[PDB]
């Protein structure tokens, strides 16, 4: 099986290897020797005289024309078990936390089919994360593809820190982080914060998050397939562990960037805006592998970059097509000053139905969305003449909607250094009561800054008493 | 030591 071949042409990832004795099928792993490290190749197309066109994951500074590769029968196999929890591995399967090897028994192959239609689960139960704008305007699903979009500087990483904290500590099962082209210091702060919070235990096997981290400066074969490594680890924690597992993939747009870079170099015609033609198919495979099945329950929060706040880029549009409950993280509401600058007027939910969550929660959510959507056209009425001629009731609903929009902001516990405020936790019933109490007309007299950075409605009462007297 | 000693000699002649 271990058939040897010859590197004959080298451009980045895109490396042509000539086999004449044993030809590996597509999506495989070739071990290039001659390097002081190992080099791995993801085999793709076979062009002739048998030629695999592989994508090379480490930097190809120094590959000789005519080198010897070894061929194994692996799509790519990684160490996977309960041993790989407190340890950071990268896409080839190897630890980059400098703690020796990973001593496991069984491995796992990175490439598999999305399971079957008959194994798709059907239950939908609400997940409450403690965030206000999540809990009433786009609630999450235990067993659903949660996605949070945003540009650059809108607050996706601080939001994913708050979800990791506030959910991975409120979880008896396991966790899997996947840093897919995330910058190295933010993942380093993640690893040190995980150690100091205790979800990673460096002394024994009492950890419950498994970290797979491919840096943002790796060749595109190592920056596309590292998301699939996170999928494989979290599938094993869902397939035959028998455990509720959650996977945090930050930031699946490096996946599509990596695919567009190799498709520039592989010899495929550029599609629409400049990405690969196989965008929807490749991301359909790697987003339909990650879903809850009848064997186990897996919930996937995905931090998903959009380029310069352009939601009509085809890769965020197809990513919208794959989710269950998205959350837009705009920038304009942070130019206002609300953090994270969350758009719920562009956010979705499969979970938000009057039988699933309730009628009270649904009606206060649609009331908040109705009064914030009306505030836009009413604000454009304001923008020419001012607050003079609207009406009694029109100025009243403008001030009420502005008060709600200031009440959507919530101090994160992980972001007590950006604003200085300590940060609070808000249950679901308190969010329902607070927004129903602002819509009910109780707080028409308090100023807009009394509701700005608060938790419950009692915190808004206390801040109004502090500002007044 | 063929050429550079001839160059040495011409360094002397310019010197």
């Amino acid at each position: 099986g271990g058939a040897t071949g010859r590197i004959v042409a080298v451009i980045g990832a895109v490396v042509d290897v000539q086999f004449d004795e044993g030809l590996p099928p597509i999506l495989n792993a070739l071990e290039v020797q001659g390097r002081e490290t190992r080099l791995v190749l993801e085999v793709a197309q076979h062009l002739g005289e048998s030629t695999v066109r592989t994508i090379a994951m480490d930097g190809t500074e120094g590959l000789v024309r005519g080198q010897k590769v070894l061929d194994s029968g692996a799509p790519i196999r990684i160490p996977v078990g309960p041993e790989t929890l407190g340890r950071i591995m990268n896409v080839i399967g190897e630890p980059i936390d400098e703690r020796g090897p990973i001593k496991t028994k069984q491995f796992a192959a990175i490439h598999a089919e999305a399971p079957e239609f008959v194994e798709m689960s059907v239950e939908q139960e609400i997940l409450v994360t403690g965030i206000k704008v999540v809990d009433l305007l786009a609630p999450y699903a235990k067993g659903g593809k949660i996605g949070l979009f945003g540009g650059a500087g809108v607050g996706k990483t601080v939001l994913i820190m708050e979800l990791i904290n506030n959910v991975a500590k409120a979880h008896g099962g396991y966790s899997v982080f996947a840093g897919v082209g995330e910058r190295t210091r933010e993942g380093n702060d993640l690893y040190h914060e995980m150690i100091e919070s205790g979800v990673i235990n460096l002394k024994d096997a009492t950890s419950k998050v498994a970290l797979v981290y491919g840096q943002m400066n790796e060749p595109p074969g190592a920056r596309a397939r590292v998301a699939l490594t996170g999928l494989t680890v979290a599938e094993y924690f869902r397939d035959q562990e028998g455990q509720d597992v959650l996977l945090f993939i930050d930031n699946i747009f490096r996946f599509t960037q990596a695919g567009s870079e190799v498709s520039a170099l592989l010899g495929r015609i550029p599609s629409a805006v400049g990405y690969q033609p196989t965008l929807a198919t490749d991301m359909g495979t790697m987003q339909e592998r990650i879903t809850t099945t009848k064997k186990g329950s897996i919930t996937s929060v995905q931090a998903i970059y959009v380029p310069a706040d352009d939601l009509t880029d085809p890769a965020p549009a197809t990513t919208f097509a794959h989710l269950d409950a998205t959350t837009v993280l705009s920038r304009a509401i942070a130019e206002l000053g609300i953090y994270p600058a969350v758009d719920p007027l562009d956010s979705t939910s499969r979970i938000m139905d009057p039988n699933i969550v309730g009628s009270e929660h649904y009606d206060v959510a649609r009331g908040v969305q109705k009064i914030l959507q009306d505030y836009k056209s009413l604000q454009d009425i304001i923008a020419i003449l001012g607050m003079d001629e609207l009406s009694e009731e029109d100025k009243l609903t403008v001030s009420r909607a502005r008060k709600i929009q200031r009440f959507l902001s919530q101090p994160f516990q992980v972001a007590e250094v950006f604003t200085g405020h300590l940060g609070k936790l808000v249950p679901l019933k308190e969010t329902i009561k607070g927004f129903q109490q602002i819509l009910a007309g109780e707080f028409d007299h308090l100023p807009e800054q009394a509701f700005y950075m608060v938790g419950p409605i009692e915190e808004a009462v206390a801040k109004a008493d502090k500002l007044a007297e | 030591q063929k050429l550079f000693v001839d160059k040495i000699r011409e360094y002397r002649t310019k010197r």
């Binding site: 004449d20 004795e21 | 050429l3 550079f4």
Partner: protein
């Protein structure tokens, strides 16, 4: 597919592709020098002005080209390797490329003999004792069991001389490049 028999020098391009196919076939059936001398006879044939004028011109109706080359093969009784080779070159229409595939397969067979294409520039018209001792030390210098085929060229511009390229390895004691090395040394 069938196991394509590896040629010693990968000549690339179209003509190298035709030549590697022909080499693998002739090395499966083990008549390599026979196919080489027949391709040399073909390359002698297709430089005649009547045959090459009939072939390079279009509107001689490709079926008639295939018929003419099959009748020329059946007249001079080629082996069944180069017969199907000339028929394939006629069917694909790359009869423009047949002296280049003859050159490429001749190169592949000359490496199959073991020759090394040695290049030497003395940069002056050298004598026979120099050539004898140079061929002696160079035949000792190359490898075991391989025969060299050397060529010499001259030019008065590069002073001194004796550059020797043997099998990609290029030893260079030319007086001009010695002055160039001392030139990079002196400008600093």
């Amino acid at each position: 597919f069938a196991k394509l028999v590896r040629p010693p020098v990968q000549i690339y391009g179209i003509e190298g592709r035709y030549a590697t196919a022909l080499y693998s076939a002739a090395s499966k059936q083990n008549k390599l020098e026979q196919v080489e001398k027949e391709l040399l006879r073909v390359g002698q044939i297709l430089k005649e002005p009547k045959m090459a004028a009939s072939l390079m011109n279009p509107y001689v109706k490709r079926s008639v080209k295939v018929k003419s080359l099959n009748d020329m093969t059946a007249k001079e009784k080629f082996s069944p390797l180069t017969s199907n080779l000339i028929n394939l070159l006629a069917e694909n229409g790359r009869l423009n490329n047949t002296p280049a595939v003859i050159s490429a397969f001749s190169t592949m067979m000359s490496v199959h003999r073991g020759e090394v294409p040695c290049t030497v520039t003395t940069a002056s018209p050298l004598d026979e004792a120099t050539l004898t001792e140079l061929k002696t030390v160079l035949k000792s210098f190359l490898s075991k069991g391989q025969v060299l085929k050397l060529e010499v060229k001259i030019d008065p511009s590069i002073m001194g001389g004796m550059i020797v390229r043997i099998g990609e390895k290029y030893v260079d004691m030319s007086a001009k490049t010695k002055i160039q090395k001392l030139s990079r040394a002196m400008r600093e």
